[PDB]
């Protein structure tokens, strides 16, 4: 029974002067992690720690807005199925903060203008922005960080493509089309402390989680030993996991693991997960050459219906 | 057969506003790592990445001096048994660089003046500094870095003291005496590439290794499955391990593991290990109350003779 998910240092891939052996070491480590656990810690991404800390400060800043202003940009008010804006807690009584055991989030994605023909299509459309926060303090750092998440998931996909079974003869670009005009939702999550008194998989391709220091929140189901693996916070790391669409694309070689967040917090906790769903119109062919075709957006919408 | 040594984030101990649960989590993780493997990765130390990169640049800078300049401060020339200065390769033919499969090092420790009564005693005395390297590029950043390593091993020892068996009833200060006027050698290591064509334990209390990015060098012997565990470089981390004197002090609860560096390098590789040996005159009592008394310096010298 494993005690931890593995860790992958991708430095050899962020620098063009690393040895072929070191790059190959990264490829094998990430391939084994994603085909065994579906999860791994990633370090060596090169995203400055000040930027990560700024993202968590944005989460805290948004959460500090009064309930009325956050509901002014409720996801109810977004365009079509773009699912952008404020996700309210399940219960609320006051304008300030959260009731214990609830959570709230700000969701934003790829900026698509309202008059674009795709606006309002699944996970596609304009973002909603809280007007009381100045651009320099919220929207601008979040969009800059979004640039960096897009570049990081591109690198992750190149490493993963190099890690597939060689007899499938997949080229290292095999995933690249998913990164063109993609669905890329990001959440700024605020978890209230636990009171004194869930199980899921991600549907997309790659998830990149920024954790705040604190007690263990995340657990990953490992079927072979039927155990929940805790994922404590590791300084400098992201938690990376594969989603259902990636598992489907790779005919099950890369696993999409069940996971849940446990709330042992005595104070409010924040996190910032970024999700690569991918281009919602891309038709993906099973990389084992079995001829199965899956359209990303149809797959994700189907997963939503099956889970709700 | 384990595949990795554990990772311990000590952030909860570098901040006084972290929860008691988080601090206890750090204590438990570090204790289990040191009593099982004797080794762990440490992150969250707060030492800036620019400072770590500078230390490795100092290693490269020193190594780039010609043989004649480096031998000007050979360890042969240090005062008494202070063991400070330049450790030359086992073989050499040119003034520049190293022959494959060899290594060289710069060694410096706690600055003790030449007229101090302890100067020249075991691992104690003044440092040798290469006269061709400007202070701002070498001696000054290394001495500041040395302060940061001393503070980090102080934190590690506090965590380790909290991880001992509760039935021994050890107080959390139990190791602190080792950090007063200690032997603290640090090396700037330069490994030549492998040619086309060792196994040991550390003698002191706590070792703190800064690795350079590259292929796996370090391996740790794990007896229960009789396997060499690779220790690849992890960004932002130090590799921490217990030495023989910590194993002795804790009556074997904390393990001093055998380890070795393997050379798969096609180009020169650098590292910066810092060693807490401790105060050489401190008499340590086995923390299980078995009455055994060990003087750190005598232990380290005896371990040197045994090897
Ligand atoms: Cl790695
Ligand atoms: Cl930890
Ligand atoms: Fe998830
Ligand atoms: Fe060693």
Q: What are the backbone dihedrals phi and psi of residue B11, each rounded to the nearest 5 degrees, phi first?
A: -55, -40
- A4 and B9 within 8 Å at the Cβ level: the answer is no
Contact (CB, 8 A) for A196 and A102: no
Helix (H, G, I), strand (E, B) or coil at A168: helix
* CA–CA separation, B249 and B279 (whole Å): 13
What are the structure tokens assigned to B84, written together? 């400070």
Whole-number Å distance, alpha carbon A6 to ligand 1 midpoint, is 9
Whole-number Å distance, alpha carbon A298 to ligand 2 midpoint, is 40
Q: How far is CA A141 from the centre of its chain?
A: 18
A227/B contact by beta carbon, under 8 A = no
Nearest to B99 by CA among B195, B198, B212: B195
Residue B215: which of A19, A264, A266 has the nearest Cβ?
A19
- Residues in chain A, how many? 308
Neighbouring-strand partners of residue A211 = A271
Find all residues with CB under 8 Å of A233, minimum gap 6, and list them. Answer: A211, A212, A213, A214, B9, B11
Contact (CB, 8 A) for B229 and B4: yes
Helix (H, G, I), strand (E, B) or coil at B142: helix
Contact (CB, 8 A) for A174 and A287: yes
What are the structure tokens assigned to A171, written together? 């080229």
Residue B9: which of A12, A19, A232 has the nearest Cβ?
A232
Q: Which residue in the block uniquely carries the two structure tokens 């991600």?
A: A202
- Domains of chain A in start order, with CATH, are 7-307 (2.60.120.330)
Angle between helices A49-63 and A139-162 (to 10 degrees): 130
Neighbouring-strand partners of residue B34 = none
B232/A contact by beta carbon, under 8 A = yes
Nearest ligand to residue B21 Cα: 2
Q: Which of B27, B231, B235 to mutate to test the interface with A (most CBs of A within 10 A)?
A: B235
User: Which method was it determined by?
Assistant: X-ray
Q: Which of A213, A216, A267, A269 to mutate to test the interface with B (most CBs of B within 10 A)?
A: A213
Q: Which residue in the block uniquely carries the two structure tokens 């490994």?
A: B191
Strands B238-242 and A259-261 turn out to be unpaired
- Please report, for residues A45, A125, A152, B128, the alpha-carbon distance to residue A183 in angstroms, rounded to integers and kept in the order given: 22, 10, 15, 60
Strands B269-276 and B206-211 turn out to be antiparallel
* CA–CA separation, A108 and A129 (whole Å): 9
**Strands, DSSP E only, in chain A?**
7-9, 39-43, 85-87, 103-108, 186-191, 206-211, 218-222, 227-231, 238-242, 259-261, 269-276, 283-285, 293-295
Mark the breaks in chain B: residue after which each occurs, C to N over 2.5 Å: 197
Contacts of A11 in chain B (CB under 8 A): 213, 233, 235
Contact (CB, 8 A) for A38 and A240: no
Please give, rounded to a whole number of angstroms, the shortest distance from the CA of A60 to a CA of chain B.
17
* CA–CA separation, B271 and B274 (whole Å): 10
DSSP state of A225: G
Residues with CB under 5 A from ligand 3 (ion): A 202
Angle between helices B20-36 and B139-162 (to 10 degrees): 100
Please give, rounded to a whole number of angstroms, the shortest distance from the CA of A38 to a CA of chain B.
17
* CA–CA separation, A178 and A296 (whole Å): 9
What are the structure tokens assigned to B219, written together? 């391996």
Query: In chain B, where does DSSP find H-type helix?
Result: 11-14, 20-36, 49-63, 67-71, 139-162, 244-249, 296-306
**Strands, DSSP E only, in chain B?**
7-9, 39-43, 85-87, 103-108, 186-191, 206-211, 218-222, 227-231, 238-242, 259-261, 269-276, 283-285, 293-295
Q: Which residue in chain B has the smallest CA separation from A264?
A: B21
* CA–CA separation, B79 and B202 (whole Å): 23
Contacts of B12 in chain A (CB under 8 A): 213
Residue B233: which of A9, A216, A264 has the nearest Cβ?
A9
- B235 and A12 within 8 Å at the Cβ level: the answer is no
Nearest ligand to residue B259 Cα: 4
Q: Which residue in the block uniquely carries the two structure tokens 């042992």?
A: A264
- A4 and B3 within 8 Å at the Cβ level: the answer is no
* CA–CA separation, A189 and A58 (whole Å): 10
What are the structure tokens assigned to B187, written together? 């090396």
Residue B215: which of A6, A25, A43 has the nearest Cβ?
A25
* CA–CA separation, B290 and B164 (whole Å): 15
- B7 and A6 within 8 Å at the Cβ level: the answer is no
Which long-range contacts does B73-76 make (Cβ < 8 Å, 24+ apart)? B73/B128, B73/B129, B73/B130, B75/B107
């Amino acid at each position: 029974p494993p005690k931890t998910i593995p860790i992958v240092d991708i430095s050899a891939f962020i620098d063009d002067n690393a040895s072929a052996q070191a790059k190959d070491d990264v490829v094998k480590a990430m391939s084994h992690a994603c085909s065994t656990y579906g999860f791994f810690y990633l370090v060596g991404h090169g995203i400055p720690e000040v930027d990560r800390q700024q993202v968590l400060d944005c989460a805290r800043l948004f959460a500090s807005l009064p309930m009325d202003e956050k509901m002014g940009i409720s996801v109810s008010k977004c365009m079509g199925q773009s699912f952008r804006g404020y996700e309210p807690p399940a219960l609320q009584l006051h304008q300030e903060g959260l009731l214990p055991d609830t959570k709230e989030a700000f969701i934003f994605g790829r900026e698509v203008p309202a008059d674009h023909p795709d606006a309002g299509r699944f996970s596609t459309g304009p973002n909603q922005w809280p007007s009381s926060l100045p651009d320099s303090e919220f929207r601008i750092p979040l969009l800059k960080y979004q640039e960096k998440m897009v570049e990081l998931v591109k690198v992750i996909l190149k490493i993963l493509a190099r890690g597939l079974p060689k007899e499938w003869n997949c080229p290292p670009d095999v995933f690249d089309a998913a990164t063109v005009e993609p669905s890329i939702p990001m959440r700024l999550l605020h978890y209230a402390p636990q009171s004194e008194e869930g199980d899921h998989t991600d549907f997309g391709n790659v998830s990149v989680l920024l954790q705040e220091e604190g007690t263990v929140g995340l657990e990953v189901w490992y079927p072979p030993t039927e155990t929940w693996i805790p994922v404590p916070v590791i300084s400098g790391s992201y938690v990376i996991n594969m989603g259902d669409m990636m598992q489907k694309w790779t005919a099950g070689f890369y696993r999409s693991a069940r996971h849940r967040v446990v709330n042992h917090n005595k104070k409010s906790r924040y996190s910032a997960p970024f999700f690569l769903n991918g281009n919602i119109d891309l038709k993906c062919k099973a990389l084992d050459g079995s001829g199965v075709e899956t359209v990303i957006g149809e797959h994700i919408r189907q997963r939503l219906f099956e889970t709700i």
